[PDB]
Ligand binder design. Structure first.
Ligand code: PX6
Ligand code: PX6
Ligand code: C14
Ligand code: C14
Ligand code: C14
Ligand code: D12
Ligand code: D12
Ligand code: D12
Ligand code: D12
Ligand code: D10
Ligand code: OCT
Ligand code: OCT
Ligand code: OCT
Ligand code: OCT
Ligand code: CA
Ligand code: CA
Ligand code: CA
Lengths: 380, 378, 160
């Protein structure tokens, strides 16, 4: 494969110390950038956006611009359009079309569209956005979110609390994503895999000073027990996370009115702790059976399951991704039927049959005894 | 014929097979990896040996390919301290020992004036991170929560021989439990120790029996161990490759005399009381005694309710209790019918019913026992 | 078993080099030597073992100091009654060879017999006597009824 990254280039003319790699600049220049002799390569991107009733304001972030570059944007369905930097200091306003030119060493721009569905066209070094002709060329103008693959498996349900409405489960979780900033060069370590062990994603992110997709369980009660926690990264920048967990989750949705004929749902929710413009769940991986089989009988029998990805409102605005696993469960009916209902039917039959007798003293005595038998069975 | 190629430790290609291959070293240090990809093949490799076509001599010199470090392992069980039948886990107390050889750990005595260097109260991971050398760390596969450890020590000899010692108390998950045949069930207690490193670095090679695997203790125990075994296998590992596993398995059973004497004999006597009353020809007395015996049965059932685990599904004992209760109630129903028949003046039919019941009931019980044996134990 | 709770932990040293350690502890200890076959007439041993974590050529227990009563008296009754105690120093095999010292305290204990006797055995004797005495009767219906009632009384007492 090819490789990507930044580089430092030192050129010398009749300076034999350059091959040592430590040549300091000296003399009068002799070489220059070749690309400056011609027109720069244009990038064009088109997006369709919609302003819902509660989402009348929209913002997008652009990639970095080098000095001397130019920026163009236009909108055709009229809403208002403006351009600000990352802090937000205004730079240009729409006349709808807009134009700007880069003065600083590095410019980071934000496009504001505020007011229905509209077409937004944006380009870098492309003044011909009025009549482009070519399909969108070059690299994307707006930054893109990093895509995360997620998967979860359930091994054993280890308890259900019917008074406090919570349950505990044992399982496995896996995450995988791609980030070129995490890449390294093998010749500096002589290795192909770099690993971190027994640390949460937050701790590793704080140690290496790079943003990573941290997560939490939405309904977690108390601390979580974790085993085999590991993060490892490849030179290309592909990273993955693995964990074996035992956790207790709150479940206020329980309803035991139809007991023992009730049916319940066990829902496990994993939420990213970062805004959706940074990381987002994109694919579901089935690395194992979602519901594992175990020897012997269980108190709860799983009938079906499902997995889904959604979006939920996030603190400090924006949105965060959610991964949900739901299990539909029922109790063992034979246990309750054979243990309770048949003896109760026989007890009721005893009190019914005595009315065939014509000696009412015997009937009264047997009824009195059967009431006590009923109470004894009830407390049994 | 498969394809053959040579790359360095980073993956940069250096030579390709024509199957034979050749290379010459330019850098100060060269670390090479041989790739063979496509059945069984013979691979011959040599350093400074262009005569590999016709070697003649048996393989000479040191090994060309790196070798995995060999680890000796042993485990002993002291006491089973608890079993949870609803959450399906158990807790055990025991001792673990590891031993291996590594020349990189060697030292020179004249720099310390000592023959043994030791580390205390630290896990293998912590020591490995402190001395910046790879060591064979391990974990329990089914560990639930934290583990309590005592007498944790690592010590190394000047030649490089190292050993690890630990006394542990741990709780292990066991979803393989099956209590259908309770109380006649038999279970397996499995303890798995897995290395946290790829098999090309460290591998379990030998089993050491430093003590009795199952220790004897004074007094009786709830579970009786019948046999045990120990085995080494290989299992798939994260980030590919493979890791070694050491497994100890105990076969256990319950104490049968306790259940038999505590439950089954009184139940048999209670059933006999309801059976014997059909010899009487005064049906009022029979009805009264049947009514009393049903209450006695219920009282005994709730008295033994303490030895009746609540699992959410039926065992053998629950089925037997239900059948016995149903038959005891049917006795009362038949007694009422016989009392009415005697009242109307049909005593002959009542006597015939008595004979029929006396013949039939034990046959029904025996047939139910045979059916249960057939459907649960064969 | 598990962690140990400690209070008033202090080490202090004199200029000559004399050092001392003090600790107040609450701890849970495993005891697989228990045998409850003769319950409630069983007798048990409570053994507390303190082992040095160093080879015997470095440090060794040499003397036993009785700074207080080994078994302290408390107001009220206790479930277990201590009959006698002993203290001893021995040597046991140590990891990485050599040997380490051990200090052992053993308490011999028994249960309160009056509690079990008065609570269980006397009522059981009276219940058995009720079923024995009825055979003097010559009206066998009354005998049968009283026997049937006494069996239920026995079961009720048992579960009580
Ligand atoms: C499974 C069944 C258990 C669940 C059933 C619960 C339902 C309740 C029982 C229904 C009983 C209805 C019978 C009527 C009755 O009991 O007495 C009335 C008659 C006499 O009536 P009359 O002469 O006053 O008109 O008295 C009679 O003469 C009727 C004759 C009936 C004969 C019953 C004797 C059967 C003997 C079979 C051998 C024992 C089977 C062992 C089973 C394990
Ligand atoms: C403390 C004692 C509790 C534990 C004792 C348990 C042992 C079982 C009791 C033993 C009872 C043996 C007496 C024999 C008996 O009960 O009946 C038979 C005789 C008549 O016999 P026969 O005429 O058929 O030959 O019937 C008789 O006539 C025998 C006469 C005996 C008189 C008993 C009445 C005593 C009245 C004393 C006042 C009440 C004491 C209050 C105590 C708190
Ligand atoms: C109440 C328990 C069930 C007993 C069986 C009842 C079936 C209906 C029979 C009605 C017969 C009426 C005769 C006078
Ligand atoms: C049901 C409890 C056991 C009682 C003993 C039964 C043994 C079989 C004897 C059958 C005798 C029938 C006489 C009419
Ligand atoms: C079984 C409960 C104790 C009752 C006292 C028994 C003492 C022995 C007396 C035997 C008397 C026999 C008379 C026929
Ligand atoms: C799906 C729920 C089925 C409930 C059936 C109850 C059966 C009661 C049996 C009584 C027999 C005398
Ligand atoms: C190995 C299982 C043997 C089970 C034997 C049950 C014995 C019941 C005794 C009843 C005597 C009245
Ligand atoms: C080792 C196999 C033992 C099999 C025991 C079977 C007992 C069947 C009768 C059950 C009555 C509750
Ligand atoms: C040391 C053990 C003595 C046991 C004595 C038992 C006494 C039973 C009393 C019954 C009186 C009716
Ligand atoms: C402990 C189980 C007793 C069940 C009744 C047995 C009757 C046997 C008839 C021959
Ligand atoms: C799965 C339900 C079985 C119940 C059978 C009841 C027969 C009277
Ligand atoms: C080990 C089983 C002993 C049970 C004896 C039962 C005698 C009726
Ligand atoms: C398998 C349980 C059956 C319960 C009713 C039996 C009546 C003879
Ligand atoms: C210490 C045992 C006292 C028991 C007395 C029993 C008198 C019947
Ligand atoms: Ca609820
Ligand atoms: Ca199971
Ligand atoms: Ca014991």
């Amino acid at each position: 494969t090819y490789t990507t990254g930044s580089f430092q280039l030192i050129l010398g003319l009749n300076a034999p110390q350059v091959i040592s790699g430590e040549g300091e600049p000296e003399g009068e220049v002799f070489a220059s950038l070749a690309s400056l002799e011609i027109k720069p390569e244009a990038h064009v991107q088109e997006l369709e956006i919609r302003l819902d009733k509660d989402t009348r304001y929209l913002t997008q972030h652009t990639r970095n611009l080098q000095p001397g570059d130019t920026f163009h944007a236009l909108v055709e369905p009229l809403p208002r359009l403006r351009l600000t930097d990352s802090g937000g200091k205004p730079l240009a306003f729409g006349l709808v079309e807009l134009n700007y030119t880069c003065d600083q060493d590095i410019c980071e721009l934000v496009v504001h569209v505020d007011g229905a569905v509209y077409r937004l066209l944006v380009g870098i070094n492309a003044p011909n956005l009025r009549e482009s002709g070519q399909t969108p060329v070059g690299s994307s103008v707006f930054l893109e979110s990093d895509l995360v693959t997620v998967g979860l498996a359930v091994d054993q349900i280890v308890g259900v609390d019917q008074r406090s409405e919570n349950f505990s489960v044992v399982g496995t979780l896996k995450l995988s994503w791609h980030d070129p900033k995490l890449g390294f060069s093998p010749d500096q370590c002589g290795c192909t895999v770099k690993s971190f062990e027994d640390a949460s994603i937050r701790a590793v992110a704080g140690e290496i000073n790079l943003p990573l997709p941290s997560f939490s369980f939405y309904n977690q009660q108390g601390n979580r027990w974790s085993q085999n926690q590991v993060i490892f990264v490849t030179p290309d920048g592909r990273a993955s996370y693995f964990e074996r967990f035992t956790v207790t989750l709150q479940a206020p949705d329980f309803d035991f009115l139809a007991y023992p004929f009730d049916r319940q749902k066990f829902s496990i929710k994993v939420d990213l702790a970062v805004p959706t413009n940074m990381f987002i769940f994109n694919e579901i991986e089935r690395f194992q059976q979602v519901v594992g089989d175990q020897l012997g009988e269980e108190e709860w029998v799983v009938t079906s399951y499902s997995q889904e990805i959604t979006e939920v409102p996030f603190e400090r605005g924006s949105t965060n991704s959610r991964f949900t696993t739901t299990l539909l469960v029922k109790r063992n009916l034979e246990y309750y039927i054979l243990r309770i209902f048949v003896p109760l039917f026989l007890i009721i039959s005893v009190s019914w049959v005595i009315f065939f007798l014509k000696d009412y003293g015997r009937q009264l005595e047997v009824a009195s005894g059967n009431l006590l038998v009923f109470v004894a069975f009830n407390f049994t | 014929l498969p394809r053959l190629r040579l790359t360095d430790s980073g993956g940069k290609p250096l030579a390709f097979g024509l199957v034979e291959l050749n290379y010459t070293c330019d850098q100060d240090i060269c670390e090479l990896v041989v790739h063979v990809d496509g059945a069984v093949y013979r691979l011959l490799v040599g350093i400074n040996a262009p005569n590999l076509r016709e070697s003649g001599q048996t393989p000479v010199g040191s090994s060309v390919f790196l070798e995995s470090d060999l680890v000796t392992v042993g485990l002993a069980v002291d006491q089973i301290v608890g079993v949870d039948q609803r959450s399906e886990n158990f807790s055990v107390v025991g001792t673990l020992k590891l031993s291996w050889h590594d020349p990189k750990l060697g030292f020179s005595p004249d720099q310390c004036g000592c023959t043994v260097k030791s580390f205390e109260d630290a896990s293998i991971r912590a020591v490995a991170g402190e001395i910046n050398l790879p060591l064979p760390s391990f974990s329990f596969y089914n560990q639930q929560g934290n583990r309590w450890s005592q007498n944790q020590v690592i010590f190394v000899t000047p030649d490089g021989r190292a050993s690890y010692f630990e006394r542990f108390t741990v709780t292990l998950q066991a979803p393989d439990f099956d209590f259908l045949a309770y109380p006649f069930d038999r279970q397996k207690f499995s303890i798995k120790v897995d290395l946290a490193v790829p098999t090309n670095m460290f591998i379990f090679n030998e089993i050491e029996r430093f003590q009795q695997v199952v220790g004897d203790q004074l007094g009786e125990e709830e579970w009786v161990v019948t046999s045990y075994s120990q085995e080494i296998t290989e299992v798939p590992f994260e980030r590919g490759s493979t890791n070694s596993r050491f497994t100890t398995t105990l076969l256990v059973k319950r104490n049968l005399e306790y259940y038999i004497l505590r439950i089954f004999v009184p139940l048999f006597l209670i059933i006999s009381v309801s059976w014997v009353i059909f010899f009487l020809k005064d049906y009022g007395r029979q009805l009264e005694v049947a009514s009393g015996n049903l209450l006695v049965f219920v009282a005994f059932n709730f008295t033994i309710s303490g030895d009746l685990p609540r699992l959410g599904y039926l065992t053998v004992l629950d089925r037997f209790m239900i059948v016995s209760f149903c038959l005891t109630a049917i006795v009362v129903l038949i007694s009422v019918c016989q009392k009415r028949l005697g009242a109307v003046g049909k005593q002959a039919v009542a006597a015939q019913i008595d004979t029929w019941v006396l013949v039939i009931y034990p046959l029904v019980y025996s047939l139910y026992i045979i059916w249960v044996y057939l459907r649960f134990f064969t």
